[PDB]
Amino acid sequence: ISEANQALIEARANDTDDAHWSTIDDFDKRIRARLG
Amino acid sequence: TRRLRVHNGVEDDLFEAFSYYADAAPDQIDRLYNLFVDAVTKRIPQAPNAFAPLFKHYRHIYLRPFRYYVAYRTTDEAIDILAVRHG
Ligand SMILES: [Cl-]
Ligand SMILES: [Cl-]
């Protein structure tokens, strides 16, 4: 909604670098490591 | 089955929200995160075009009661969790 966030969401959509796209369980375990 | 992928900056977006809860309301942190994992793994995969558009082809789904939403994109092959922003 805020042009800031539209840029942020389009940026990430446009990020084609495969290294930034964590699968879900990868992603989950990572957050658990934090504050867990 | 569509394949499910999460940008890393979501991790950023998350703790940017947890901040408003740690120390004072640490119970919310697990609540809101478990809502998020729900929406991402069950709610959105169930019917990804049903949830309201955010802008252009992007969609979102509020993790109610929290006023944070999950912005996302749905091609015929994939579902890409793009952000978790406030609203
Ligand atoms: Cl359906
Ligand atoms: Cl619905």
Author numbering:
A (entry chain B): 36 to 71
B (entry chain A): 2 to 88
Article, verbatim:
The widespread and highly conserved ParDE TA systems, part of the RelE/ParE superfamily, target DNA gyrase. Toxin-antitoxin (TA) systems are found in most bacterial genomes and generally comprise small bicistronic loci encoding a protein toxin and a protein or RNA antitoxin. Here, we present microbiological, biochemical, structural and biophysical characterisation of the ParDE1 and ParDE2 TA systems from M. tuberculosis.
The ParDE2 crystal structure exists as a heterodimer containing a half-unresolved ParD2 antitoxin. The ParE2 toxin is comprised of β1 (R4–H8), α1 (N9–Y22), α2 (P27–Q47), β2 (R60–Y63), β3 (Y69–T75), β4 (A79–H87), with the C-terminal M88–E105 being unresolved. This positioning creates two major hydrophobic grooves on the surface of the ParE2 toxin which run along the β sheet core and through to the underside of the toxin between the hairpin helices. Representing the ParD2 antitoxin alongside a surface rendered ParE2 toxin clearly demonstrates the specific interaction at the conserved hydrophobic patches, as they align closely to the truncated region of ParD2. Notable contacts are the ionic bonds formed between ParD2 E45 (on α1) and ParE2 K57 (found on the loop region between α2 and β2) and between ParD2 R47 (on α1) and ParE2 (D14) (on α1, also). Finally, given the time taken to crystallise, and that there is no remaining space in the crystal due to packing, it was considered likely that ParDE2 underwent limited proteolysis during crystallisation.
